[PDB]
mmCIF file of C-alpha atoms in Angstrom:
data_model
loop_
_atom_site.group_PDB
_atom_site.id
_atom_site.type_symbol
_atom_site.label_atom_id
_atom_site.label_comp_id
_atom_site.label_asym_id
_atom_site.label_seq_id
_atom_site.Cartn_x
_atom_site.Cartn_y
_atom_site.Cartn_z
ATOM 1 C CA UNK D 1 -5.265 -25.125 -17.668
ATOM 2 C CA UNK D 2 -2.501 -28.246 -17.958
ATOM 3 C CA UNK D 3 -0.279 -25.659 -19.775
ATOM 4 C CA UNK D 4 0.645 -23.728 -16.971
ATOM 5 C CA UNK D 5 -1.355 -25.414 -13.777
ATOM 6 C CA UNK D 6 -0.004 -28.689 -12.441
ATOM 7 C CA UNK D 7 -2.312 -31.498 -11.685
ATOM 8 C CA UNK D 8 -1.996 -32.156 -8.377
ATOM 9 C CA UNK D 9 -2.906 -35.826 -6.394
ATOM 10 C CA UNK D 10 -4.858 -34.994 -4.045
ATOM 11 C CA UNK D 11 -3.425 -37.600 -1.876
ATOM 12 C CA UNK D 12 -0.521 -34.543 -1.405
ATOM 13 C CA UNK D 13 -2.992 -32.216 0.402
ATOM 14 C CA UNK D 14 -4.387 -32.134 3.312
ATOM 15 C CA UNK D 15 -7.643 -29.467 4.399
ATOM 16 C CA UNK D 16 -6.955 -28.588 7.946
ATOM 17 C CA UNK D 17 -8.963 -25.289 8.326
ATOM 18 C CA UNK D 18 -11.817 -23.226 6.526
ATOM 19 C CA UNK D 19 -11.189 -19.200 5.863
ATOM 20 C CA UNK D 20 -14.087 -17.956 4.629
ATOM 21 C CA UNK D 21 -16.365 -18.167 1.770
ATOM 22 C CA UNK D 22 -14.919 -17.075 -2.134
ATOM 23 C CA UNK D 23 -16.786 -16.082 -5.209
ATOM 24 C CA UNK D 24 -17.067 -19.594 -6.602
ATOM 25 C CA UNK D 25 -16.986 -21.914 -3.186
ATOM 26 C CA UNK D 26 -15.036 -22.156 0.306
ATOM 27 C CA UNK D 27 -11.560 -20.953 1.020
ATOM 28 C CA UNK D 28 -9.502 -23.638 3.020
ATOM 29 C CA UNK D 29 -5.867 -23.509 4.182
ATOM 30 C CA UNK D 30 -3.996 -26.966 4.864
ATOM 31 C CA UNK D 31 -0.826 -28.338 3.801
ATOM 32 C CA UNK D 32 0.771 -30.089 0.485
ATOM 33 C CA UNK D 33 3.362 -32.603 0.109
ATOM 34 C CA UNK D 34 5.543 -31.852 -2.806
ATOM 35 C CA UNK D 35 7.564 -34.610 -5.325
ATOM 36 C CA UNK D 36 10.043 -34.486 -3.035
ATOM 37 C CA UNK D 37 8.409 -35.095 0.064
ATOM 38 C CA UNK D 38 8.772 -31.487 1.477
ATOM 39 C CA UNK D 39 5.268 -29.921 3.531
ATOM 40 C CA UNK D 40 4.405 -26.857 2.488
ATOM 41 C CA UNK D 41 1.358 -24.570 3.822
ATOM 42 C CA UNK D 42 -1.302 -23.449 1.240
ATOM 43 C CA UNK D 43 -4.114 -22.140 0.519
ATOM 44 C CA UNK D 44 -6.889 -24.335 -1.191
ATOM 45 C CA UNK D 45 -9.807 -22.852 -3.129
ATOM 46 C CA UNK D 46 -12.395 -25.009 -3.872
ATOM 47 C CA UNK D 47 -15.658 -25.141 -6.934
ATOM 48 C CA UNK D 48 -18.823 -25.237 -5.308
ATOM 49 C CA UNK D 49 -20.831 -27.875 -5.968
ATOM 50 C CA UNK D 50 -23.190 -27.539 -8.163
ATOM 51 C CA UNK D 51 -21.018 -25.497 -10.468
ATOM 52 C CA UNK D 52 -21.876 -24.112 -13.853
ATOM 53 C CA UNK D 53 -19.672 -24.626 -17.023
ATOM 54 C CA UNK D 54 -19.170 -20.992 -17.139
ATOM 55 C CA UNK D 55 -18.283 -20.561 -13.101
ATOM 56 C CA UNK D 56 -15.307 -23.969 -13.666
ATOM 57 C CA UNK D 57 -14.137 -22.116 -16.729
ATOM 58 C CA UNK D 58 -13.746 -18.732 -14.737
ATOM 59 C CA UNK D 59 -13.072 -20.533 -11.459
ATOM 60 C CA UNK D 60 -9.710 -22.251 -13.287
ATOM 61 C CA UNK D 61 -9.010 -19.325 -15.950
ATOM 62 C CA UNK D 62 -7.848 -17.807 -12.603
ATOM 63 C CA UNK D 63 -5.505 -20.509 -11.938
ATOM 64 C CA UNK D 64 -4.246 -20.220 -15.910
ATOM 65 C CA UNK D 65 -3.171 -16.850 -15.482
ATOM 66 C CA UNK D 66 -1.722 -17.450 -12.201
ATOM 67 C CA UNK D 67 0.413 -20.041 -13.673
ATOM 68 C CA UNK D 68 1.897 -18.332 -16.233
ATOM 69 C CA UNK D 69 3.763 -15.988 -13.133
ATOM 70 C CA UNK D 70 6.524 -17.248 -11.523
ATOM 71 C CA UNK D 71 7.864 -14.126 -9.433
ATOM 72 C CA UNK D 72 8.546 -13.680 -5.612
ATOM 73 C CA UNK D 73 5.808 -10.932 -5.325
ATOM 74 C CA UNK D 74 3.075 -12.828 -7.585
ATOM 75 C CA UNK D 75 0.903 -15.404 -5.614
ATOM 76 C CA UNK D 76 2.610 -18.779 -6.296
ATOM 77 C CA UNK D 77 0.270 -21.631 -8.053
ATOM 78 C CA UNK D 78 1.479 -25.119 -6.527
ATOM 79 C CA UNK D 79 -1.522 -26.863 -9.006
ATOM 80 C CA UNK D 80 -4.962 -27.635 -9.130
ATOM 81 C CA UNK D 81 -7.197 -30.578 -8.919
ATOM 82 C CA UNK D 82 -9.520 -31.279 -11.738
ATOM 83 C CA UNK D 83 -9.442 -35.071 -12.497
ATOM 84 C CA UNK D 84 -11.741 -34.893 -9.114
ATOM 85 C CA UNK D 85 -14.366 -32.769 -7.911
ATOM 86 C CA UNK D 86 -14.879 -30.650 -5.851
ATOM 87 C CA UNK D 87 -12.151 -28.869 -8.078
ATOM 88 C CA UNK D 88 -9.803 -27.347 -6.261
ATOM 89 C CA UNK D 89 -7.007 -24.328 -6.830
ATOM 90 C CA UNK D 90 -3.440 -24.250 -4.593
ATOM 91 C CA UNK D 91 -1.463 -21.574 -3.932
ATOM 92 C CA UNK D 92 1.231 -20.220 -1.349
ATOM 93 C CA UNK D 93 -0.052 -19.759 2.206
ATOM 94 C CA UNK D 94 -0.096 -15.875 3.119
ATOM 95 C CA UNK D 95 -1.114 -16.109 6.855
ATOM 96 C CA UNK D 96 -1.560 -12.512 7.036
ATOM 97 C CA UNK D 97 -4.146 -12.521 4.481
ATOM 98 C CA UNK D 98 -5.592 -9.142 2.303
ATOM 99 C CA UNK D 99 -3.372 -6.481 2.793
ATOM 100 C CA UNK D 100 -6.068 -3.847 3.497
ATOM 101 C CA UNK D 101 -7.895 -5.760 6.394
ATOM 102 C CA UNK D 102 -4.247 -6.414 7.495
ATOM 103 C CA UNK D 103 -3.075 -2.760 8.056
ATOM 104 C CA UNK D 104 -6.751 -1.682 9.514
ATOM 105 C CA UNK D 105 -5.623 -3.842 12.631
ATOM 106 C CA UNK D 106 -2.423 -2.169 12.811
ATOM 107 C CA UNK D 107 -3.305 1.537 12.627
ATOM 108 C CA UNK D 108 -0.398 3.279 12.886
ATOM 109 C CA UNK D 109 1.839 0.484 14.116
ATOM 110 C CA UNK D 110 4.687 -0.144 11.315
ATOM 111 C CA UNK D 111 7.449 1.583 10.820
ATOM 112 C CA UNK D 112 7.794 3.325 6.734
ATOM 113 C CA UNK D 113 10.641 1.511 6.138
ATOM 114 C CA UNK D 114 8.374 -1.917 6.874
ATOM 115 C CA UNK D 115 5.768 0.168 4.856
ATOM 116 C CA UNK D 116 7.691 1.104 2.055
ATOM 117 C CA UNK D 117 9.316 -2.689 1.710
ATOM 118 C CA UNK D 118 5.895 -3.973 1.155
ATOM 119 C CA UNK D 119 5.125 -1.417 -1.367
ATOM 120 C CA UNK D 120 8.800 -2.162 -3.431
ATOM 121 C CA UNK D 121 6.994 -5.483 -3.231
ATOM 122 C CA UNK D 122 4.004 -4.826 -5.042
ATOM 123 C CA UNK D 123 5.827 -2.396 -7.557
ATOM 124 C CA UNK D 124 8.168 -5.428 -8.518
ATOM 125 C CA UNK D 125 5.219 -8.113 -8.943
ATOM 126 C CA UNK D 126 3.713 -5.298 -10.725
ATOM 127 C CA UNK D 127 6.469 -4.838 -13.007
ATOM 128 C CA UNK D 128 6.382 -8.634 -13.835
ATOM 129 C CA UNK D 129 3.082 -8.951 -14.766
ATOM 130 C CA UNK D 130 2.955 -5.505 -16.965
ATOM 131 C CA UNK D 131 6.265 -7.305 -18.484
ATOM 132 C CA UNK D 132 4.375 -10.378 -19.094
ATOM 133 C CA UNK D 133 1.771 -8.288 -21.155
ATOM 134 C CA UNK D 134 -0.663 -8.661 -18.755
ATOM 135 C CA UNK D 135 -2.933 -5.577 -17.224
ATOM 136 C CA UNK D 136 -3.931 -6.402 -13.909
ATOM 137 C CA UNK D 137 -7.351 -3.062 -14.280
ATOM 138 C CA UNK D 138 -8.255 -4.847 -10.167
ATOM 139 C CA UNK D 139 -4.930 -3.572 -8.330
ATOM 140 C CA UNK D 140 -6.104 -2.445 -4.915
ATOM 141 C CA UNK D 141 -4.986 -3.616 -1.613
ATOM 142 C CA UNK D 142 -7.623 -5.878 -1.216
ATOM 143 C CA UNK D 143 -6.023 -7.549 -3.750
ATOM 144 C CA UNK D 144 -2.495 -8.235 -2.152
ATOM 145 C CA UNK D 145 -2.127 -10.773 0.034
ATOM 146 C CA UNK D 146 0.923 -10.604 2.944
ATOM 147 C CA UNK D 147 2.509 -13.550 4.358
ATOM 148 C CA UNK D 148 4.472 -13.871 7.526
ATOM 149 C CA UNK D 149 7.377 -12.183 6.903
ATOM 150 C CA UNK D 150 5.496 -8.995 5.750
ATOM 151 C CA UNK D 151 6.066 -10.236 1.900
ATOM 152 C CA UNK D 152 3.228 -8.661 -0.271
ATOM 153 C CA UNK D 153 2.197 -10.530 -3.474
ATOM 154 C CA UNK D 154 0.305 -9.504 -6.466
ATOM 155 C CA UNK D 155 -3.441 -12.031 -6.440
ATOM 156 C CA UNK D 156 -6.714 -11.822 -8.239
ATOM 157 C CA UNK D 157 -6.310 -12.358 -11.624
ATOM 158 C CA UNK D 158 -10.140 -12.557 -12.071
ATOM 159 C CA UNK D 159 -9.977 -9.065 -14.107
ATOM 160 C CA UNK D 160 -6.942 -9.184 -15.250
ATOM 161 C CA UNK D 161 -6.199 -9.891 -19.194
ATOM 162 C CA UNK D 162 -3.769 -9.623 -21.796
ATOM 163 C CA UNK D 163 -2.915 -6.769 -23.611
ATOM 164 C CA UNK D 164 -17.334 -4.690 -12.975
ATOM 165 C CA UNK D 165 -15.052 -2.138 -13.247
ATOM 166 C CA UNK D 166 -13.552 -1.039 -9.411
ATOM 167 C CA UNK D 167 -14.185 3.170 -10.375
ATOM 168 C CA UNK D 168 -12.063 4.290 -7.241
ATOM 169 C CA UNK D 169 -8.936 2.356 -8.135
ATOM 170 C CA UNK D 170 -9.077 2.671 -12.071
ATOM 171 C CA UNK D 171 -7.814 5.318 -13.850
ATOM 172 C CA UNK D 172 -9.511 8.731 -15.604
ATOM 173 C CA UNK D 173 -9.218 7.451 -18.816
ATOM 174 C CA UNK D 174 -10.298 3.521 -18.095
ATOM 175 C CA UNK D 175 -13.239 5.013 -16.304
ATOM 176 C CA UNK D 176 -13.772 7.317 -19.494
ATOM 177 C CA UNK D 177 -13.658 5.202 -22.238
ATOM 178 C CA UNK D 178 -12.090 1.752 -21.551
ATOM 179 C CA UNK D 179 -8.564 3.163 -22.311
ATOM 180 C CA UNK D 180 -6.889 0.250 -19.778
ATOM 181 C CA UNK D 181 -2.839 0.025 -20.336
ATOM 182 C CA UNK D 182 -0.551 -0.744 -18.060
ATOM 183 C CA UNK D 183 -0.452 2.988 -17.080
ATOM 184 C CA UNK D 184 -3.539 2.489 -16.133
ATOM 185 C CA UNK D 185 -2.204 -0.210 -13.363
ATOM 186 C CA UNK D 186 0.445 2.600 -12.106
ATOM 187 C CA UNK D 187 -2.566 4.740 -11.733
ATOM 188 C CA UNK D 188 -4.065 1.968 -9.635
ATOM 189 C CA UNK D 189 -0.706 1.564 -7.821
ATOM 190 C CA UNK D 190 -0.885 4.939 -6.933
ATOM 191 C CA UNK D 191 -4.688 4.122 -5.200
ATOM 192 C CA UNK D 192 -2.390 1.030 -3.410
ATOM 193 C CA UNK D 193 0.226 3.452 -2.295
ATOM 194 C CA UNK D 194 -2.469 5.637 -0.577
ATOM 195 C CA UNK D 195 -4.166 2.985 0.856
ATOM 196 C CA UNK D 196 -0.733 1.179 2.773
ATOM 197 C CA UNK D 197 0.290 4.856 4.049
ATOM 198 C CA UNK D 198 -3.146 5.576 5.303
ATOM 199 C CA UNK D 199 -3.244 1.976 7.157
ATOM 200 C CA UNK D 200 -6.195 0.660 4.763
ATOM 201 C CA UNK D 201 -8.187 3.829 4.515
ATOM 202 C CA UNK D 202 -11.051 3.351 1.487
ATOM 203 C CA UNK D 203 -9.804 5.750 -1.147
ATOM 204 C CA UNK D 204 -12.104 8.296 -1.529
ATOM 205 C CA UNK D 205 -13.602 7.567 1.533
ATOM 206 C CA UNK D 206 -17.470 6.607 0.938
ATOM 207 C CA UNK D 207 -17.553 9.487 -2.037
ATOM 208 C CA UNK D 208 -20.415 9.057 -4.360
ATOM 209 C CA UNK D 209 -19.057 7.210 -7.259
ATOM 210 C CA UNK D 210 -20.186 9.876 -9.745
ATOM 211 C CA UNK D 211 -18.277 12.528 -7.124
ATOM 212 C CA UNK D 212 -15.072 10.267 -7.112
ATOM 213 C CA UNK D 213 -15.300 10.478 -11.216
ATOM 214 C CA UNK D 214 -15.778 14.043 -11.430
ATOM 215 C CA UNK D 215 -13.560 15.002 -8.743
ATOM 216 C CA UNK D 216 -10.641 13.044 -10.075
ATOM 217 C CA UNK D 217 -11.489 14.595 -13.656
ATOM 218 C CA UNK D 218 -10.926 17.856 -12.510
ATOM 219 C CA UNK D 219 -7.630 17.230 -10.986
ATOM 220 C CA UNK D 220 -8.653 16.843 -7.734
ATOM 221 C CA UNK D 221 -6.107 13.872 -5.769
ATOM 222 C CA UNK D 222 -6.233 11.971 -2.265
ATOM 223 C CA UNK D 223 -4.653 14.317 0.126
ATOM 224 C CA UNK D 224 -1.488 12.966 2.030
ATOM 225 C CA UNK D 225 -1.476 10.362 4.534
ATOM 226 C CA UNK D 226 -0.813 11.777 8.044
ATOM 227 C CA UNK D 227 2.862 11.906 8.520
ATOM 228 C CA UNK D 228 3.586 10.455 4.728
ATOM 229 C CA UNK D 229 7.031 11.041 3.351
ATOM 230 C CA UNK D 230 6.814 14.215 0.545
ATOM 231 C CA UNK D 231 8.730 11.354 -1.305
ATOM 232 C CA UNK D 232 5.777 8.641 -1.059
ATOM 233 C CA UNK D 233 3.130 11.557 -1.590
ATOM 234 C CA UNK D 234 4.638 13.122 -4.804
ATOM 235 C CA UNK D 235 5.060 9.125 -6.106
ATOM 236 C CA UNK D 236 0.983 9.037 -5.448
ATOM 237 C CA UNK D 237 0.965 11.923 -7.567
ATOM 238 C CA UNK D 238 3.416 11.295 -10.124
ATOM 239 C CA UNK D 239 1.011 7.925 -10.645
ATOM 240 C CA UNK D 240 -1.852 9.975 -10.642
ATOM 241 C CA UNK D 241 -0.830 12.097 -13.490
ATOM 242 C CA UNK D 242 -3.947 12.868 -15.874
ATOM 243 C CA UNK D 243 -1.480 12.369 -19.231
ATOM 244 C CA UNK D 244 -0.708 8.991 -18.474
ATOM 245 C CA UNK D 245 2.571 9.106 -20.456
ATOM 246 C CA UNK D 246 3.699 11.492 -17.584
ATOM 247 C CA UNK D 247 3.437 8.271 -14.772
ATOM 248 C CA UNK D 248 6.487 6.518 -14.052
ATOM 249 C CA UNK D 249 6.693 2.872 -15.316
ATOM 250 C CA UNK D 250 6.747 -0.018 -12.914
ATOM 251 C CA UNK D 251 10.688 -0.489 -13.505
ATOM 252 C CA UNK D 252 11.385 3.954 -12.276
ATOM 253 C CA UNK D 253 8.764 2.827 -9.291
ATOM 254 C CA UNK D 254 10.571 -0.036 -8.059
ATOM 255 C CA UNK D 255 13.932 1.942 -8.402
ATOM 256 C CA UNK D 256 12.843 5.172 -6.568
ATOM 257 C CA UNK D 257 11.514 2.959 -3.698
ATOM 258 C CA UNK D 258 14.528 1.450 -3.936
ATOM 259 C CA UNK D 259 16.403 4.438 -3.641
ATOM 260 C CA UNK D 260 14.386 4.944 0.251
ATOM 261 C CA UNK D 261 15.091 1.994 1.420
ATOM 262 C CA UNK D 262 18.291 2.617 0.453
ATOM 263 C CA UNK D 263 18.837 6.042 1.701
ATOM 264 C CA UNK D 264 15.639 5.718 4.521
ATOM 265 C CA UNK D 265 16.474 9.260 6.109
ATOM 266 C CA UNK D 266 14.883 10.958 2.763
ATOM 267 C CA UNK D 267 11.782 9.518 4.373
ATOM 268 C CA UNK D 268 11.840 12.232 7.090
ATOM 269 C CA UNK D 269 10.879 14.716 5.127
ATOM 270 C CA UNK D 270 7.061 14.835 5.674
ATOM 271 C CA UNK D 271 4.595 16.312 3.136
ATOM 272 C CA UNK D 272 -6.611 22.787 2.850
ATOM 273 C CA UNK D 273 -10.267 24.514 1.220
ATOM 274 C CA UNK D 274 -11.330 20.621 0.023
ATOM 275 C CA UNK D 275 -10.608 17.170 1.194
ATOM 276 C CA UNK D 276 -9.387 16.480 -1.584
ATOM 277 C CA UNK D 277 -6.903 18.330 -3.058
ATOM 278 C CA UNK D 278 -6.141 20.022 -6.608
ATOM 279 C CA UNK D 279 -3.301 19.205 -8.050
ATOM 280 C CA UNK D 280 -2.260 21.751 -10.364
ATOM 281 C CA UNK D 281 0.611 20.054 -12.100
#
């Protein structure tokens, strides 16, 4: 992990607060003291004790894929703790936490400007880590974590590998037959994009997962958010194309978000037999 994870002394941090529980131990938040005496906030993840070979080599393959990022809207490793146990991984504080459980508070609250900036967000971690070679094949909004300042970040590199599965964010031909590319993340992006403009909505709401498969196969798409920009809705399904040579790459998302933020009236232009809807395209 010393190839891209710093070792950190744990002298540096400081555990001021419990989270929750994770998938191998506790979540913590506290503080670190960097080399140069600046106090950051982070979040600390610690091992359980207890631990089996296979859950540390898991637990800190995390932290090995997370080190090889260094973007604004990837979550930042600050190091990990090994020489001493528990073992622990460090990363950025994001005191808003997931993004989902985030926008469920705020129903309706944000503007789609601050909506769309968090999205531009994920498109550009997005397009760093499908530059880096990597396919994320978890990228939900679950997954994205939001700090302070509304900043969303790219986490969870537990699936994630280098160029089980969650069926309502993946894409028809993942599902299918294992076909993951980084198309397959757009088409997951898409899922993300749906989820922020419907305030945290569960995409497909609680659809059988054979129903969600079949559905999708036949062409079938999440309908629009209420009020949702035609421009956001036809990115959804421009992600969501079945041919997924036809989906835009990370680089043409961030750029066409770019373009609303830039020109933020095209967002007032808003977008029947099913819930769902066909798609004919």
């Amino acid at each position: 992990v010393h190839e891209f994870a710093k070792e950190l002394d744990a002298t540096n941090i400081s555990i001021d607060k419990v989270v929750g529980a994770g998938e191998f131990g506790e979540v913590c938040s506290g503080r670190l003291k960097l080399p140069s005496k600046k106090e950051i906030s982070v979040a600390i993840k610690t091992l359980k004790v207890g631990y089996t070979e296979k859950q540390r080599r898991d637990f800190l393959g995390e932290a090995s894929i997370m080190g090889q990022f260094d973007h604004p809207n990837i979550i930042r490793l600050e190091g990990v703790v090994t020489k001493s146990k528990p073992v622990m991984i460090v990363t950025e504080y994001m005191e808003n936490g997931s993004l989902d459980s985030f926008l469920r508070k705020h129903d309706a609250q944000f503007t789609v400007i601050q909506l769309v900036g968090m999205l531009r967000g994920i498109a550009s971690g997005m397009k760093y880590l499908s530059d880096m070679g990597y396919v994320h094949r978890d990228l939900a909004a679950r997954n994205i974590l939001i700090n302070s300042n509304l900043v969303c970040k790219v986490s969870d590199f537990g699936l994630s590998r280098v160029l089980k599965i969650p069926i309502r964010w993946t894409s028809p031909e993942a599902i299918a037959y294992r076909k993951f590319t980084s198309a397959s993340d757009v088409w997951s992006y898409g899922i993300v994009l749906w989820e922020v403009m419907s305030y945290g909505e569960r995409p497909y709401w609680e659809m059988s997962n054979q129903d969600v498969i079949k559905a999708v196969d036949e062409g079938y798409r999440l309908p629009p958010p209420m009020d949702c920009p035609a421009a956001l809705y036809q990115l959804m399904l421009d992600c969501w194309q079945k041919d997924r040579n036809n989906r835009p790459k990370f680089e043409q998302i961030v750029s066409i978000l770019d373009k609303l933020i830039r020109n933020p009236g095209s967002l007032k232009i808003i977008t029947r037999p099913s819930n769902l809807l066909l798609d004919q395209s």
